[PDB]
Amino acid sequence: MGISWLDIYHVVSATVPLYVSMTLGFLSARHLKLFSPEQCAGINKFVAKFSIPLLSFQIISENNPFKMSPKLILSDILQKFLVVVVLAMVLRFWHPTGGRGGKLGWVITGLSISVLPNTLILGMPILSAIYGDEAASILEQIVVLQSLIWYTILLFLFELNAARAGTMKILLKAWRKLIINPNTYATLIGIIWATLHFRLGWNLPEMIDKSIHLLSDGGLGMAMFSLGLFMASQSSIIACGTKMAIITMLLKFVLGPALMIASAYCIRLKSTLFKVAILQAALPQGVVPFVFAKEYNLHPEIISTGVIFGMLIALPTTLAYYFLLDL
Amino acid sequence: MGISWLDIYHVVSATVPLYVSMTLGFLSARHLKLFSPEQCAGINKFVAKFSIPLLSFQIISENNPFKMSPKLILSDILQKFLVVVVLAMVLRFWHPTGGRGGKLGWVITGLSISVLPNTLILGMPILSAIYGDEAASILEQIVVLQSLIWYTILLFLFELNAARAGTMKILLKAWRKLIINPNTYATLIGIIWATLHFRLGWNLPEMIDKSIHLLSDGGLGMAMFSLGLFMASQSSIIACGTKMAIITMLLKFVLGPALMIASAYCIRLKSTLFKVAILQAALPQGVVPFVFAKEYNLHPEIISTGVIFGMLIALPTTLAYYFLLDL
Ligand SMILES: CCCCC/C=C/C/C=C\CCCCCCCC(=O)OC[C@H](COP(=O)([O-])OCC[N+](C)(C)C)OC(=O)CCCCCCC/C=C\C/C=C/CCCCC
Ligand SMILES: CCCCC/C=C/C/C=C\CCCCCCCC(=O)OC[C@H](COP(=O)([O-])OCC[N+](C)(C)C)OC(=O)CCCCCCC/C=C\C/C=C/CCCCC
Ligand SMILES: O=C(O)Cc1c[nH]c2ccccc12
Ligand SMILES: O=C(O)Cc1c[nH]c2ccccc12
């Protein structure tokens, strides 16, 4: 059959390595009292400045920009626009935190959750197993687009919000803060090198590949360690409160995938493309958005509980959507 | 015909990644002003507490305790004893930094220099190329013994010195500081697991293997990053000064290899064992001892200027010793 206990074991064995790093970081920050808050911030700074850029480059460079399916990109952009419209409309009617002011900061922490699943680590063992090798290849384009356009746009939104804390000058300041970022350079060099490699066949030198790998290899372990450190910093696992936690998880696991269903139907995705493009949306929050929020101090307590409690519901949620799509 | 420009290229391409990580760390600490001294200390603390133990375990577990050559272990112990004796005799007459006290710290640094080469990363490309695949296994045994006994003894000496800043009480305090050290637990679990794996055939579960790898993969990149950060902290690249730099370089690249030659001759190592055991000592200083010194703030200035300017002389030094041994 499509689903088996062997698939469940592969999914669980893919997830547990992340929770081991998370728990080690949390214990080292809280129980073992190893890293002071400044040192935890320094570890997260290293992760955001040297481990994510050096892995965004690896993701983007190892995809052919010319074979990316236009339908998938159109569907993803349509999802993102629909989610942005819905979130903006909702805030006008009721703002969170007791109906106070401020659209950005929430229109950013809602896009960090709703429209940025975890695909590289957990999406593969789940969906490639459920739907075979085709799902892996289809989701590879989604992951590369995520690292290519969406993280850069999210960083621009973060820095625009930071600047906002005299209308074109703010945008210019946001742009200037963007250019000096290492993520933008990582993605630009990644796309340029993907072009060169897949057009002129310029294989990256082994020396440079090894030098990049030395720093990028531990990126995921360090990122989950940083999430654990922050968890230790926060008083409770559900640091945003139950109500906000309910709304955050609802946005992540119902609205995001439902709007992806709407987008896939609108773009007329056929057969596996329609099915594999929506089960990807209903996936854990990820820890790149968490890294950005923690560095920018933009309501990371919402991202934390989402990451911790969504890697337990990604598998059941994908099973539920797969059963729903069967008939 | 034993040495070729292709060998030089492999050695250089194995060394360059470490210098890339080092330079990135140094720039990030000095020119880019990213990590404050506290954050640099936090990154180094993470490296010492999570990256080295999780790699000492990987090194020790993958060895076969029942296939270690007794002659190699005896030769290594004899070299270490001869060194310790020579350093103690020298410290009696002339003390470093003029005539002062502090024998234990200076002998600890002298041992960290003379009797702890770099074999895992640079020894394999260099001596395996010079002497073929035969030297690979012998150097592997040297590396396993290094991670098994010598690093633990070095940590005990470091903590004894720290506790000395009422004779059996100090030793007991050193032991208590040792037991809580993550490195000793990593080495003990590693040796026990190697015993289990190579005696009863137990295989480490895939889940646990991936959990360990997530954190241990970036260990070397982060270690070189930390060394670069410390370099940025120091006023000049030759932090200890020329005279002390001359004495440190001499201790590492003449006394160490010379005493290893004496030890190999005494133990009657035959043919490749005699040659491979002495060309390994004349190798860079390594960055595990630097990590320990930086954590314990015990003259890391003398280790940084070796880890740099020794990875340039490791290749010519190996060529020189190989030529000397030919006739
Ligand atoms: C054949 C070759 C193929 C390509 C090989 C590519 C390999 C590498 C791939 C991707 C890039 C990985 C980057 C990882 C390290 C990033 C470190 C970094 O830079 O951290 C951002 C840094 C900090 O900025 P801040 O404002 O936070 O702090 C400033 C504070 N205070 C105002 C007080 C000074 O940024 C600054 O300093 C601003 C200055 C620029 C920062 C970015 C420098 C690195 C990026 C591009 C330049 C060249 C790279 C390699 C060669 C490419 C091809 C020519
Ligand atoms: C089939 C299975 C095969 C085996 C699989 C195992 C793989 C693991 C391999 C190697 C170990 C890697 C350890 C890496 C993390 C180490 C972190 C750590 O521990 O950092 C040292 C920590 C801090 O000490 P501190 O004094 O610096 O600060 C205390 C300050 N203040 C007094 C204020 C509280 O130490 C303390 O807290 C002291 C307490 C002990 C610290 C060490 C804990 C980890 C080691 C062993 C325990 C169990 C391990 C796993 C199971 C093994 C098999 C049964
Ligand atoms: O889930 C992923 O896409 C992997 C991932 C998330 N944040 C990271 C930070 C550093 C290295 C890898 C990752
Ligand atoms: O043995 C080596 O040269 C590799 C090495 C030195 N220090 C380290 C710290 C963390 C991970 C690997 C290493």
Q: HEC string of chain B?
A: CCCCHHHHHHHHHHHHHHHHHHHHHHHHHHCCCCCCHHHHHHHHHHHHHHHCHHHHHHHHHCCCHHHCCHHHHHHHHHHHHHHHHHHHHHHHHCCCCCCCCCHHHHHHHHHHHHCCCCCCCCHHHHHHHHHCCHHHHHHHHHHHHHHHHHHHHHHHHHHHHHHCCCCHHHHHHHHHHHHCCHHHHHHHHHHHHHHHHHHHCCCCCHHHHHHHHHHHCCHHHHHHHHHHHHHHHCCCCCCCCHHHHHHHHHHHHHHHHHHHHHHHHHHCCCCHHHHHHHHCCCCCCCCHHHHHHHHHCCCCHHHHHHHHHHCCCHHHHHHHHHHHHHC
Q: How far apart are CA B276 and CA B280, in angstroms?
A: 6
Kindly give the distance from the C-alpha atom of residue B204 to the centroid of ligand 3, in angstroms, as a whole number. 25
Ligand nearest to the CA of A50: 1
Q: Is A258 on the interface with B (CB under 8 A)?
A: no
Ligand nearest to the CA of A295: 1
Is A52 annotated among the ligand-binding residues? yes
Half-sphere exposure of A214 (CA within 13 A, CB side): 25
Q: What angle do CA A63, A269, A107 make, to 5 degrees?
A: 75
Q: How far apart are CA B108 and CA B103, in angstroms?
A: 8
Q: Please, are residues A142 and A150 in contact by the beta-carbon 8 Å criterion?
A: no
Distances, alpha carbon B121 to alpha carbons A1, A323, B12, B130, in Å = 47, 50, 11, 15
Collect all residues with Cβ–Cβ distance below 8 Å to B31 and sequence separation of at least 6: none
Q: How far apart are CA A182 and CA A32, in angstroms?
A: 33
Shortest CB distance from A17 goes to which of B17, B35, B210?
A: B210
Resolution (A): 3.2
DSSP character string of A173-212: HHHHHHHTSHHHHHHHHHHHHHHHHHHH--PPPHHHHHHH
Residues of chain B in contact with residue A39, where contact means CB-CB under 8 angstroms, are 38-39, 41-43, 45
Nearest residue of chain A to residue B19 (CA atoms): A211
DSSP character string of A274-286: HHHHHHTTSS---
Encode A23-50: b = buried (16+ Cβ within 10 Å), e = exposed. Answer: ebbbbbbbeeebbeeebbbbbbbbbbbb
The region, left, alpha or beta by phi > 0 then psi within -120 to 50, assigned to residue A132 is left
Residues of chain B in contact with residue A225, where contact means CB-CB under 8 angstroms, are 46, 50, 215
Distances, alpha carbon B288 to alpha carbons A64, A158, A307, B141, in Å = 40, 38, 34, 18
CB contact under 8 A, B28 and A50: yes
Rg (CA), chain B: 19
Q: How far apart are CA B145 and CA B147, in angstroms?
A: 5
- Amino acid A203 reads N
Residues of chain B in contact with residue A13, where contact means CB-CB under 8 angstroms, are 206-207, 210
Q: Please, are residues B144 and B68 in contact by the beta-carbon 8 Å criterion?
A: yes
Q: How far apart are CA A255 and CA A251, in angstroms?
A: 5
Q: Please, are residues A287 and A307 in contact by the beta-carbon 8 Å criterion?
A: yes
Residue nearest to atom 35 of ligand 2 (CA): B180
Q: Is the CB of B189 under 6 A from ligand 2?
A: yes
Which pair of structure tokens corresponds to residue B66? 């029942």
Kindly give the distance from the C-alpha atom of residue A186 to the centroid of ligand 4, in angstroms, as a whole number. 27
Q: Which residue precedes each gap in chain A (C to N above 2.5 Å)? A: 165
Q: How far apart are CA B170 and CA B162, in angstroms?
A: 10
Which domains does chain B carry? 5-326 (1.20.1530.20)
Q: How far apart are CA B142 and CA B110, in angstroms?
A: 19
Closest-CA residue to B78 (of B230, B288, B239, B269): B269
Q: Is A124 on the interface with B (CB under 8 A)?
A: no
Collect all residues with Cβ–Cβ distance below 8 Å to A178 and sequence separation of at least 6: A152, A155, A156, A159, A184
Collect all residues with Cβ–Cβ distance below 8 Å to A326 and sequence separation of at least 6: none
Which pair of structure tokens corresponds to residue A40? 């935890």
Experimental method: cryo-EM
Closest-CA residue to B288 (of B113, B156, B26): B113
- Amino acid B104 reads L
Q: Sign (positive/negative) of CA torsion B157, B249, B13, B221?
A: positive
Q: How far apart are CA A78 and CA B284, in angstroms?
A: 56
Q: How far apart are CA B235 and CA B229, in angstroms?
A: 12
Encode B127-165: b = buried (16+ Cβ within 10 Å), e = exposed. Answer: bbbbbeeebeebbbbbbbbbbbbbbbebbbbbbbbbbee
Is A16 annotated among the ligand-binding residues? no
Nearest residue of chain B to residue A17 (CA atoms): B211
Residues of chain B in contact with residue A18, where contact means CB-CB under 8 angstroms, are 214
Q: How far apart are CA A276 and CA A126, in angstroms?
A: 11
Collect all residues with Cβ–Cβ distance below 8 Å to B67 and sequence separation of at least 6: none
Q: Please, are residues A156 and A170 in contact by the beta-carbon 8 Å criterion?
A: no
Kindly give the distance from the C-alpha atom of residue A238 to the centroid of ligand 4, in angstroms, as a whole number. 38
Residues of chain A in contact with residue B35, where contact means CB-CB under 8 angstroms, are 42, 45-46
Q: Sign (positive/negative) of CA torsion A245, A249, A251, A252?
A: positive
Which pair of structure tokens corresponds to residue B148? 């098994």
Q: Is A133 on the interface with B (CB under 8 A)?
A: no
Q: Please, are residues A106 and A79 in contact by the beta-carbon 8 Å criterion?
A: no
Q: DSSP character for A171? A: H
The region, left, alpha or beta by phi > 0 then psi within -120 to 50, assigned to residue A96 is beta
Q: How far apart are CA B313 and CA A118, in angstroms?
A: 46
Closest-CA residue to B186 (of B197, B196, B177, B194): B194
Q: Please, are residues A65 and A194 in contact by the beta-carbon 8 Å criterion?
A: yes
Q: How far apart are CA B48 and CA B46, in angstroms?
A: 6
Collect all residues with Cβ–Cβ distance below 8 Å to A303 and sequence separation of at least 6: A109, A112, A113, A285, A289, A290, A293, A294
Q: Which residues line ligand 1 (CB under 6 A)?
A: A 49-50, 53-54, 57, 180, 182, 185-186, 189, 193, 208, 212; B 32-34
Any idea which residue has 């060099």 for tokens?
A189
Ligand nearest to the CA of A52: 3
Q: Is the CB of A22 under 6 A from ligand 3?
A: no
